[PDB]
Copies of this chain bind each other. A is one copy, B any other.
């Protein structure tokens, strides 16, 4: 199924790079394209696109989900199952975008929040040529045991997480850091002290700085 969602064309009229923003459970692309609005002033040759996830969110009918979740449970198993169902849809979206813009994985940064960060890492690391970068806010690695076997490229990864997160506990990103480093990825971690399941100002600043290094 084709995804769509809001997009912001490059300020300069001809994109040379692409940032794909992936929302979290119960959110939508309109929410995430605000990050794009924030950054576009700084990165005038960059196009920003924020697809809506493929299904209506079970818990919030006004938003979307990459995959379904069960409540009052540790959500480990829902993630495992769901990341593989969502993967082909996100992968095909990326192909469609590259067809429409004449760009490719090397010109592209996948940025996600929460469930979207989980997808960014799952789909991003399976692409056969490397992205420019992955930025994962408040996620984790779904099926880390499968990753050694299935990892297809090693873009640099920035993991950003609030330490008081009681939705996706910070150990998600703290365990991910050594795992990706063990796999050959240039991974970095930034912990937003005192923040929960959100993008803190300090997290956003860290990400902007990283974007400045690579764009």
Residue positions of A touching B, CB distance < 8 A: 129-130, 153-155, 182-186
Complex A-B: 17 CB contacts under 8 Å: A129-B186, A130-B154, A130-B184, A130-B186, A153-B184, A153-B186, A154-B154, A154-B183, A154-B184, A154-B185, A154-B186, A155-B184, A182-B184, A183-B184, A184-B184, A184-B185, A184-B186
Which residue of B is nearest A152, CB measured? B186
Residue numbers in B under 8 Å from A154 (CB-CB) = 130, 154, 183-186
Q: How many of these chains are in the complex?
A: 2
Residue numbers in B under 8 Å from A184 (CB-CB) = 130, 153-155, 182-186
Residue numbers in B under 8 Å from A155 (CB-CB) = 184
Residue numbers in B under 8 Å from A183 (CB-CB) = 154, 184
Cα A129 to Cα B157 in complex, Å, equals 12
Residue numbers in B under 8 Å from A153 (CB-CB) = 184, 186
Looking at the assembled complex, report how far the CB atom of A180 sits from the nearest CB atom of chain B, in whole angstroms: 10
Looking at the assembled complex, report how far the CB atom of A28 sits from the nearest CB atom of chain B, in whole angstroms: 33
Looking at the assembled complex, report how far the CB atom of A173 sits from the nearest CB atom of chain B, in whole angstroms: 20
Cα A130 to Cα B215 in complex, Å, equals 12
Looking at the assembled complex, report how far the CB atom of A34 sits from the nearest CB atom of chain B, in whole angstroms: 29
Looking at the assembled complex, report how far the CB atom of A148 sits from the nearest CB atom of chain B, in whole angstroms: 9
Cα A153 to Cα B130 in complex, Å, equals 13
Cα A64 to Cα B183 in complex, Å, equals 37
Cα A183 to Cα B186 in complex, Å, equals 9
Looking at the assembled complex, report how far the CB atom of A209 sits from the nearest CB atom of chain B, in whole angstroms: 15
Looking at the assembled complex, report how far the CB atom of A156 sits from the nearest CB atom of chain B, in whole angstroms: 8
